[PDB]
Design an enzyme around this catalytic site. Sequence first.
Site, mmCIF file in Angstrom:
data_model
loop_
_atom_site.group_PDB
_atom_site.id
_atom_site.type_symbol
_atom_site.label_atom_id
_atom_site.label_comp_id
_atom_site.label_asym_id
_atom_site.label_seq_id
_atom_site.Cartn_x
_atom_site.Cartn_y
_atom_site.Cartn_z
ATOM 1 N N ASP A 12 48.877 49.539 41.385
ATOM 2 C CA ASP A 12 47.759 48.697 41.766
ATOM 3 C C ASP A 12 46.497 49.410 41.319
ATOM 4 O OD1 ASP A 12 46.585 46.358 43.099
ATOM 5 O OD2 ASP A 12 45.753 47.840 44.463
ATOM 6 N N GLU A 14 42.051 49.314 41.140
ATOM 7 C CA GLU A 14 40.745 48.728 41.408
ATOM 8 C C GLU A 14 39.917 48.865 40.142
ATOM 9 O OE1 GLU A 14 40.712 47.049 44.118
ATOM 10 O OE2 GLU A 14 42.428 48.153 44.951
ATOM 11 N N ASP A 112 46.441 43.954 36.182
ATOM 12 C CA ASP A 112 46.528 45.393 35.964
ATOM 13 C C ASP A 112 47.025 45.699 34.562
ATOM 14 O OD1 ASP A 112 47.388 44.422 38.761
ATOM 15 O OD2 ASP A 112 46.558 46.403 39.178
ATOM 16 N N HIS A 159 41.652 46.392 49.416
ATOM 17 C CA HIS A 159 41.229 46.687 48.045
ATOM 18 C C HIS A 159 41.144 48.186 47.797
ATOM 19 C CE1 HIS A 159 40.099 42.365 48.264
ATOM 20 N NE2 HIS A 159 40.669 42.385 47.072
ATOM 21 N N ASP A 164 47.527 48.862 48.974
ATOM 22 C CA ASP A 164 47.892 47.534 48.501
ATOM 23 C C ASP A 164 49.274 47.503 47.851
ATOM 24 O OD1 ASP A 164 45.755 46.352 49.767
ATOM 25 O OD2 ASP A 164 44.481 46.159 47.998
HETATM 26 NA NA NA Z 1 45.799 44.213 42.674
#
Ligand code: NA
Length: 195
Positions: A12, A14, A112, A159, A164
């Site tokens: 994951d 950001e 991603d 987030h 996550d």
């Molecule tokens: Na995500």
Amino acid sequence: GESMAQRMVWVDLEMTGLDIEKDQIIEMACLITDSDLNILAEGPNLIIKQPDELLDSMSDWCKEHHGKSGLTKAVKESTITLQQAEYEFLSFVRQQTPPGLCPLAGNSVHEDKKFLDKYMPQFMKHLHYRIIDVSTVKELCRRWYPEEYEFAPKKAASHRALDDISESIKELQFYRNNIFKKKIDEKKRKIIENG
Ligand code: NA
């Protein structure tokens, strides 16, 4: 062989935003599961330095969300370059998965993948081109199993990358246990013989 090739590379990220032409990766976490979603190894969990000018010009959504989570402040203090972060992730997957065989996994993890194909291409070269998109299963659950869909776990949606991933695995586990068909196991077979 087959067990190794059936691992999954959960990631994951950001980002400073959704614009592939300007936005950058600011946080990334990775872990490995076996084919049955058991966590085998925790990978790096890194906050990546990006320029002040970019953070200061993020969308209001990103300013608000990365601000209150502490991520914006942590990016400004980070000493981890994108290149060094990519190396940590690449070294990790080289220790955990056979080259080219295992997919990225996560919710809408194609987003991603778009950022990783651009900014971590050597990491991506270790992975297969297919993905395990938990949100594909989400969208099928909503359509085909609307009653069961109401019971999916609630997400905190912080987030932040590592937290996550865990929520994504939990969601996929929920679908496996509730909308996929049942199978024999070691315990049921022993009962069938006992009966
Ligand atoms: Na995500």
